[PDB]
Amino acid sequence: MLIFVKTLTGKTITLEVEPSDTIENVKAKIQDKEGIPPDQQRLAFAGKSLEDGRTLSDYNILKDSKLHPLLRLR
Amino acid sequence: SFVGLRVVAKWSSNGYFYSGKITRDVGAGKYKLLFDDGYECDVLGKDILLCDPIPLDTEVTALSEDEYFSAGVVKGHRKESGELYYSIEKEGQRKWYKRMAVILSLEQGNRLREQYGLG
Fold it and tell me: This protein's superkingdom (chain B) (predicted)?
C-alpha cells in the first residue's frame, strides 16, 4: 500500500507498507530510503502520534488502495 | 528562459510530480528546482512539466483535509494574495486545495508530458 511521508526538510517520500508493518518497521523503511535514523523519527497521522510498539493496523489508517495517507515527521 | 517558471516535477523514475519552480539550468538536461515545500534538488528536464496552472479536467492526486492523498479532477483554480488554489472533485464533491497539496502520479503526469513537458 502506498503511503507518503513528509520529512522535516519539506521533502515528501513514498513507501510501500501493509497494515501489519510495525511502526518501527516504518521508521526503518524511512531510514533505508532517506537516511534518517529511527531515533530522530517521531511520526504522526492527522495529528495523532504513531508509536513504537504498535502496527499500522492499530491506527485504522489503511483502507483501500486509493487512499494514500500522509504521515508527518515531527 | 525556464528560470523562475512554476512547474510540476518529479525526482525519481516512478515518483510523483510535485509543484515548485526552476531556480537554475545546470546543463546535461538537469535543472535546479525549489519545490514549494522547501526541498531543492537537481531534476532531469524530462521529469518537468511546464504547466501552471494545471489545466481543467486533469486527473491529479490531492491531499484532503483528512490527510489522505487520493485522485481527483481539477475543475477550477483561483489566485489569492499570490497563492493558487484548485477546486478539485473527489467522489462527486468539490473542495479547495492549495497548490502545494496537489501532486501527480507517474501516470497522471505522463498524460501531460506531450503538451507541457520541458524540452
Answer: Eukaryota
Residue matched to cell numbers 515545500: B37
Query: Do residues B78 and B40 share a domain?
Result: no
CB B90 within 8 A of CB B71: yes
- Give the residue from B18, B62, B57 showing the smallest Cα distance to A67: B62
- Contact list in B for residue A45 (CB cut-off 8 A) is 67
DSSP letters spanning B45-64: GGGEE--SSPPTT-EEEEE-
Residues of A in contact with B35 (CB under 8 A): 10-11
Distance from CA of A59 to the nearest CA of B (A): 14
Neighbours of B78 (CB within 10 A): 11
Resolution (angstroms) equals 1.2
List the CATH number of the domain containing B67.
2.30.30.30
Q: Is A32 exposed, middle or buried (0-12, 13-18, 19+ CB in 10 A)?
A: exposed
Parent domain of B95:
59-116
| B60, B51 Cβ separation under 8 angstroms | no
